[PDB]
Amino acid sequence: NKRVVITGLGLVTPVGLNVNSSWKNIVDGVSGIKTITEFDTSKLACKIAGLIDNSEKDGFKLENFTQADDINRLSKMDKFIHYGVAAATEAVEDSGWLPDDEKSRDRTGLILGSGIGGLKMIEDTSIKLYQENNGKVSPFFIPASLINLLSGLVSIKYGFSGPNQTAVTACSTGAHAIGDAMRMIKHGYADVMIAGGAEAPVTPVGVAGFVAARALCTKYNDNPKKASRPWDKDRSGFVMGEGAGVVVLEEYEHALNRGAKVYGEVIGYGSTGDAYHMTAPHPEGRGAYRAMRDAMLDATITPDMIDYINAHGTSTTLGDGIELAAVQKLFLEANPKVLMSSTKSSIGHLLGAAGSVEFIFSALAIRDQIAPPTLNLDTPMDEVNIDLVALKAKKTKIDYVLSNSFGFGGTNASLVIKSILV
Amino acid sequence: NKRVVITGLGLVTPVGLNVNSSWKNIVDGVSGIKTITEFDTSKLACKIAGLIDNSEKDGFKLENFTQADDINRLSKMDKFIHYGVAAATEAVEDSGWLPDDEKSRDRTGLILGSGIGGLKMIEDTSIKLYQENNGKVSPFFIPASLINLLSGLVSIKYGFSGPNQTAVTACSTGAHAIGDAMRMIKHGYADVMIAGGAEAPVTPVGVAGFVAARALCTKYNDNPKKASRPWDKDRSGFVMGEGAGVVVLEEYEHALNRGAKVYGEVIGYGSTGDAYHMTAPHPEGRGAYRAMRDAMLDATITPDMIDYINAHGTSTTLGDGIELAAVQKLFLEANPKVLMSSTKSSIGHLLGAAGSVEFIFSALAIRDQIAPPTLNLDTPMDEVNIDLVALKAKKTKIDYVLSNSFGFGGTNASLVIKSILV
Ligand SMILES: [K+]
Ligand SMILES: [K+]
Numbered sequence: 001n002k003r004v005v006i007t008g009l010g011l012v013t014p015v016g017l018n019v020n021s022s023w024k025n026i027v028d029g030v031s032g033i034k035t036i037t038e039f040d041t042s043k044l045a046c047k048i049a050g051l052i053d054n055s056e057k058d059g060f061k062l063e064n065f066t067q068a069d070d071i072n073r074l075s076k077m078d079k080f081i082h083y084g085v086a087a088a089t090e091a092v093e094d095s096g097w098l099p100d101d102e103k104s105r106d107r108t109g110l111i112l113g114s115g116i117g118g119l120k121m122i123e124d125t126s127i128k129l130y131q132e133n134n135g136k137v138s139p140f141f142i143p144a145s146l147i148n149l150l151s152g153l154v155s156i157k158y159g160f161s162g163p164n165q166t167a168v169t170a171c172s173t174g175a176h177a178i179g180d181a182m183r184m185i186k187h188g189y190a191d192v193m194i195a196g197g198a199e200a201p202v203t204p205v206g207v208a209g210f211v212a213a214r215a216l217c218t219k220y221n222d223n224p225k226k227a228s229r230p231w232d233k234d235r236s237g238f239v240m241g242e243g244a245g246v247v248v249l250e251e252y253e254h255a256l257n258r259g260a261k262v263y264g265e266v267i268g269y270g271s272t273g274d275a276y277h278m279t280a281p282h283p284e285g286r287g288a289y290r291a292m293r294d295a296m297l298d299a300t301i302t303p304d305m306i307d308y309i310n311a312h313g314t315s316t317t318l319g320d321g322i323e324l325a326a327v328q329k330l331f332l333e334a335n336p337k338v339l340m341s342s343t344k345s346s347i348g349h350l351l352g353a354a355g356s357v358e359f360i361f362s363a364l365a366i367r368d369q370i371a372p373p374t375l376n377l378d379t380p381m382d383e384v385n386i387d388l389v390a391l392k393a394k395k396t397k398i399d400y401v402l403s404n405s406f407g408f409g410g411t412n413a414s415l416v417i418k419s420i421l422v
Numbered sequence: 423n424k425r426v427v428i429t430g431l432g433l434v435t436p437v438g439l440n441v442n443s444s445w446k447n448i449v450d451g452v453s454g455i456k457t458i459t460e461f462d463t464s465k466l467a468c469k470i471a472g473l474i475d476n477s478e479k480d481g482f483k484l485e486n487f488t489q490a491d492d493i494n495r496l497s498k499m500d501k502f503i504h505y506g507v508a509a510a511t512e513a514v515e516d517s518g519w520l521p522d523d524e525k526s527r528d529r530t531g532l533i534l535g536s537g538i539g540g541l542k543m544i545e546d547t548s549i550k551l552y553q554e555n556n557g558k559v560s561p562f563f564i565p566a567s568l569i570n571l572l573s574g575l576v577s578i579k580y581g582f583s584g585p586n587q588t589a590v591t592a593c594s595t596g597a598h599a600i601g602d603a604m605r606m607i608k609h610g611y612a613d614v615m616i617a618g619g620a621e622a623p624v625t626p627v628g629v630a631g632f633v634a635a636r637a638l639c640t641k642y643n644d645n646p647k648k649a650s651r652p653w654d655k656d657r658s659g660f661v662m663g664e665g666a667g668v669v670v671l672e673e674y675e676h677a678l679n680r681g682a683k684v685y686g687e688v689i690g691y692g693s694t695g696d697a698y699h700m701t702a703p704h705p706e707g708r709g710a711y712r713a714m715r716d717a718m719l720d721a722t723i724t725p726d727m728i729d730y731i732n733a734h735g736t737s738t739t740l741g742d743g744i745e746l747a748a749v750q751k752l753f754l755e756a757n758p759k760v761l762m763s764s765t766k767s768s769i770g771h772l773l774g775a776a777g778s779v780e781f782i783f784s785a786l787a788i789r790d791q792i793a794p795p796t797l798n799l800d801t802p803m804d805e806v807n808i809d810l811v812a813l814k815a816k817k818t819k820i821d822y823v824l825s826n827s828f829g830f831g832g833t834n835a836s837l838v839i840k841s842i843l844v
């Protein structure tokens with residue numbers, strides 16, 4: 001029964017193309033939510049999103065992380081794969097794990113997911129086939145669209161020949177991927193795992209879909225950076241975002257033996273279902289409560305021990321209130337000083353990438369002893385009874401962190417990380 | 423480590439709407455491959471598929487497995503979800519596991535997947551939005567398209583509130599789902615798991631996709647039942663199919679304590695990556711060989727002990743030969759009498775549902791002491807040195823079965839099942 005540590009981080013987010021720029025911006029209270037410009041939004045009620053920089057000079061480019069020979073093939077893939085490969089490349093390079101022997105490669109697996117996957121690829125390819133009406137699509141269409149080709153391409157890139165798998169659980173995806181990858185190492189099936197989520201869901205049919213589900217904030221289109229306001233009384237839905245978050249997990253002795261960087265230990269994983277509704281959260285938050293609770297029981301810790309909670313915290317009316325009541329039920333009496341914040345206040349809701357991106361932020365809170373802010377928390381809902389780190393980052397003692405993710409289908413995942421020295 | 427048994431089976435396949443009809447037809451040498459009629463194939467080079475019966479009288483209907491009040495909501499979902507819910511409903515009812523109590527519901531999880539998921543839903547919805555250009559899609563679009571809403575809806579139907587997860591690994595999906603579900607029970611995180619795969623990939627953009635990848639047989643459109651011919655010299659690509667295969671897995675004592683029917687014990691699981699190519703299988707079969715080898719090591723058995731192998735066996739030129747050479751390398755010296763067959767010879771390639779459907783066939787081969795035929799094996803390739811059960815089913819002693827699934831991204835899964843009598 002093996003201990004599992006975090007030895008590499010990778011990020012592509014609406015506030016940075018790597019971990020260092022993203023985290024500086026999160027901590028400084030910078031928002032990455034912007035006006036959509038790449039397609040016509042004149043008929044869409046929501047006109048904003050958390051978007052990856054694509055300026056000529058500083059923007060996201062395949063060449064920044066891909067050798068000249070591999071650019072062509074990568075460019076044929078859906079953007080979720082671009083983002084995923086870029087985050088994984090950063091994580092792998094950060095970890096120093098570049099095995100060149102068979103055993104080490106065979107003991108390296110991957111669990112990389114997306115909630116929706118190759119949405120733009122399928123949308124564009126479908127429309128184009130309808131237009132040309134010649135029965136012909138690109139030879140690259142299938143692999144470009146498949147959720148598992150993110151794991152495929154990272155595997156190919158580094159020769160990782162262990163389990164080649166995914167998690168796909170809507171807005172919980174990135175968390176399940178990391179939890180499942182931890183379990184794989186815990187039980188001895190792999191020594192190193194590349195894990196997380198990636199998403200590129202900001203397309204015409206994607207935004208229209210979430211608008212039709214009434215999930216999105218549609219009333220701050222003139223002031224995009226004010227839209228995502230978890231637990232604020234003017235909240236009225238989430239803001240979609242895009243990007244990826246990938247980590248290297250590693251068996252603890254293995255990491256120590258090669259001199260790896262060690263950010264923290266993954267000690268608890270809760271995974272539950274609401275069993276209630278396709279899109280609406282359990283009215284009593286039963287699934288969310290149980291995931292948090294089980295994560296801590298799995299860790300053999302008590303709720304007083306948590307210092308900081310990175311919430312799911314999407315800026316929905318129902319969801320934020322249900323999460324807040326579940327958290328307060330679990331933590332208020334035993335840990336009235338606990339901090340909780342939503343970084344979706346800054347970058348929006350990256351859907352299947354949310355959980356992994358936020359797992360990374362959680363690890364960085366431990367590294368830097370700082371809780372990132374809930375931006376836009378100007379008028380907190382009445383039920384609030386804990387510190388939600390409104391507006392500005394707060395330096396504090398952070399030894400244990402809980403991170404939550406919930407998704408459509410009632411699927412819930414919670415992860416507990418601990419600092420090494422405590 | 424808990425022992426894990428199979429206590430329920432569910433099938434929707436091109437040769438039957440349930441397990442009994444499907445299995446009778448498989449054994450009897452019936453083919454479910456037919457001409458595509460639901461959409462215009464005049465510009466598609468492949469015009470055939472393994473298709474679920476949809477006649478007025480005997481065809482697939484939601485009503486057959488869905489209470490009147492739930493039909494409307496289910497009908498908004500993609501067909502992969504319809505097929506998945508149908509197979510899971512059969513499996514759950516077959517197992518008798520219909521807990522009313524909270525503890526039991528909380529210990530019941532799901533790992534239900536698809537390779538491509540809601541392809542028709544995304545394709546249709548994208549085209550229709552492009553046409554209407556009014557910023558509006560159905561409110562049901564997002565959940566109807568999400569892979570994890572199969573697990574979501576089955577969870578809701580039965581109140582199963584344990585882990586609510588998926589596996590998504592292209593053509594290996596159904597095998598990884600079952601293997602992961604077994605591991606979940608093995609290590610104590612659940613007592614019962616609903617697991618498998620579902621796929622509805624036969625759409626205009628789906629077929630065009632696989633044609634463009636040069637994956638499909640395009641030479642037997644006038645004789646559909648002859649197209650899928652694994653290891654036959656005239657093979658020239660796979661035939662796409664649709665359906666689902668779902669099982670109930672259960673911790674052994676738990677099953678015994680409630681008097682469950684027990685089909686077999688899942689004893690081995692291998693999961694590997696080729697790390698070679700997006701779509702082409704490793705030319706030396708390294709990933710496939712290792713998955714088989716590891717599945718047997720994981721089972722603590724030796725290769726002489728396997729009686730029957732349900733191959734991946736898709737009817738491709740390279741793939742069939744690679745699998746054959748890997749199988750013969752592993753088995754020929756120690757087990758020259760081993761039987762191997764591909765049931766894709768009858769129903770085609772159900773992509774993400776293939777592995778779970780074939781896992782079910784594997785269990786039934788044990789139940790009925792019969793190996794299903796490789797149809798169309800008229801002129802075996804020269805390399806063949808084992809019994810491929812050409813043309814007609816063969817009764818024999820079957821106590822241990824190996825089942826393989828390989829997919830794009832170089833992902834490989836092998837499962838070993840044994841008779842519970844030993
Ligand atoms: K979180
Ligand atoms: K098989």
Ligand code: NA
Nearest residue numbers: 726727728729
């Ligand atoms: Na034998």
